[PDB]
Amino acid sequence: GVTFDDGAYTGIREINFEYNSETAIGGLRVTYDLNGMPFVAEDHKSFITGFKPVKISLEFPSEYIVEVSGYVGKVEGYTVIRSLTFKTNKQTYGPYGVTNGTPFSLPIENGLIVGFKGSIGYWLDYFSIYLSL
Amino acid sequence: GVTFDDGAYTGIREINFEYNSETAIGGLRVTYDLNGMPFVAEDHKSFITGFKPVKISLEFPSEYIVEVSGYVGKVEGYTVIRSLTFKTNKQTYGPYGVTNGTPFSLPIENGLIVGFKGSIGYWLDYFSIYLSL
Amino acid sequence: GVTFDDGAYTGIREINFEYNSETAIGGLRVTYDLNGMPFVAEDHKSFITGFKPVKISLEFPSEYIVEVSGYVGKVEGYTVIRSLTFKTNKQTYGPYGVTNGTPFSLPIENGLIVGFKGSIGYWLDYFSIYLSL
């Protein structure tokens, strides 16, 4: 897929992404906080359509993500992120997608997610998370 | 003066500011690096004119500031930053302004300046520096 | 189990821990780097014996951990860490223990493990990792 790297910011305000209950996660676009101002990052689109979108609007700054988890599996032979769950200190959003395959989880005891990077083709191939105090 | 706080970014690309050889430092506008992209921050203007401008264009990312120093003194009774000097790993820019009064210096052995905040009225009242790896 | 928290240091020099191919991970003792000096932290012992020990001596500072992974599962009804694998930039140590249950993985793209905390009773109940540049 096309690689992307939003880089680092000072927090997360909103996360919008696509998912297909039969396949996997699609595109995603994050709205970060940049020194108190909302900063809408680039839209990392899927190569295809047919997804259901989800828009997670966090009550920044009182609400923040404390865990990201999901499932990794193959779709048409490609190893991709098939499901995602975002747990905040206030509630849980998800799971969205197909909760089948190999699970992964990044619980955060202290610190904040301040950026995302990865790759998206037909589906979200993989992703990494920026962490900072 | 009017307080400002640019917040934090990932580096410095350019620093533009005013100075008057008879008074002190005036307004300033910093162009930061934000995850590889130039990010021009807000212009923090002086309440007056009559200054000489200086534009420091750093050869980002090979060139970076290793020390900020200057002088603090009174102008019309107000305690302000009267002079500034920016030393990088490649060269020294300054001093600019009036090198009289109380000196100050922030040499950086390891780390980077990633943001500025302060206050500007007729002149630069004071300022703080954001540091990060 | 008895909770422990080694806190943060400046790197990892050695990791010693117990494992039982039939049950799970036992006790562990980490030798950290503390500003260039080896610092042997407290020995977090298992409530029992019968384990096989493993001593991972890292070629500090050229060698460092780039991923910690393993399996979580039940032993006598308790949810514990049953297996661990430590991948460095030079080689892979493990898996050690029982690779059955729910997998977990913490790949590190940039940054360093500088501390461990957790709980150990008969087996390693759970653990967290300190990350820093």
């Binding site: 900072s132 | 060139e63 | 793209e109």
Partner: peptide
Amino acid sequence: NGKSQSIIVGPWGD
């Protein structure tokens, strides 16, 4: 250099 560094964990999905 002049580029601020960040702690990055992952990737997940490989």
